Amino acid sequence: AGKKVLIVYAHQEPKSFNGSLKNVAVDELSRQGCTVTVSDLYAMNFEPRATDKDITGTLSNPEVFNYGVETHEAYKQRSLASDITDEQKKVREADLVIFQFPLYWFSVPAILKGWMDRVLCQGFAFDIPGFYDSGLLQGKLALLSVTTGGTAEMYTKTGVNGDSRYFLWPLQHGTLHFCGFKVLAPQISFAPEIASEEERKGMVAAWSQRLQTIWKEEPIPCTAHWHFGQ
């Protein structure tokens, strides 16, 4: 205490189940006295494509464009597009980053994928070496709050979709752990469109209630064993 939270939110419709989860998060964290910022990606028309427009200085190799090389250089030089550096400041200052989104093809919506591809650049979020437990965002927490079309039963080892933890791997491990975050347990709200009124109201209050005690949680062990079992 005090703490800063950044909610990276990816939904088009403010009256949605995602919008309600993001709003109870802002309400609950604000009530506790935390500092809260929301990056509402669709509302910002956030640029998801990794292009040469993300660099505004002299290119290190202006004959063969390599996005990774040019963004890492631009980061050190401070010539990245300012939409990227606005996001990096929010992440740099945050103690906790919550990503709020509907599952799209077992992953994040593209607009949010583009935030991860463009904001978590080398130099800022990781270095080579300086990744996983040595990633540059070490000491920060991150949490996925995901909604699905598919039911909890569908997302079991024997269900048609495989276990829910399987689709978490690229995001929790390959992205967040890689940058050094400690990952808190995912919040997964299954199948709200199918749920009843009471069940949807229960899922919102469960999230709200879990946030009351978020600062007391331990991270998951972000390993293959946690994601896949043995």
Ligand X SMILES: COc1cc2c(C)cc(=O)n(C)c2c(OC)c1OC
Ligand Y SMILES: Cc1cc2nc3c(=O)[nH]c(=O)nc-3n(C[C@H](O)[C@H](O)[C@H](O)COP(=O)(O)OP(=O)(O)OC[C@H]3O[C@@H](n4cnc5c(N)ncnc54)[C@H](O)[C@@H]3O)c2cc1C
- What residues form the annotated binding site for FAD? 11, 17-20, 103-106, 147-150, 155, 193, 200
Query: What is the closest distance, in whole angstroms, from the C-beta atom of residue 193 to ligand X in the complex?
Result: 7
First to last CA, the chain: 38
Rounded to an integer, what distance in angstroms lies between the CA atom of residue 31 and that of residue 40? 20
Q: Give the three-state DSSP class for 80.
A: strand
Please pick, from the candidates 51, 201, 212, 221, the single residue that binds ligand Y as defined by CB under 6 A. Answer: 201
Residue 161 CB contacts under 8 Å (≥ 6 apart), including other chains: 150, 154, 155, 167
Between 13 and 218, CB nearer to ligand Y: 13
Q: Which of 173, 189, 191, 207 binds Zn ion (CB under 5 A)?
A: 173
From the list 34-42, 100-108, 136-144, 218-226, the region that binds ligand Y by CB under 6 A is: 100-108
Is 195 an interacting residue with respect to ligand X (CB under 6 A)?
A: no
Does 184 sit near Zn ion (CB under 5 A)?
Answer: no
Contact region with ligand X (CB under 6 A), list: 4-12, 43-51, 137-145, 147-155: 147-155
- Using the rule CB under 8 A, give the single segment among 84-92, 167-175, 203-211, 213-221 that binds a second copy: 167-175
Q: Pick from 1, 20, 14, 3: which is nearest to 145 by CA?
A: 20
Q: How many residues bind ligand X (CB under 6 A)?
A: 9
Q: What is the DSSP letter of 168?
A: H
Q: Which is nearer to a second copy, 19 or 32 (CB)?
A: 19
Q: Give the burial string for 168-207 (b: 16+ CB within 10 Å, else e).
A: bbebbbebbbbbbbbbbebbbbbbbeebeeeebeebbeeb
Q: Counting every residue, how long is the chain?
A: 230
Interface residues with ligand X (CB under 6 A)? 68, 122, 128, 149-150, 154, 161, 174, 178
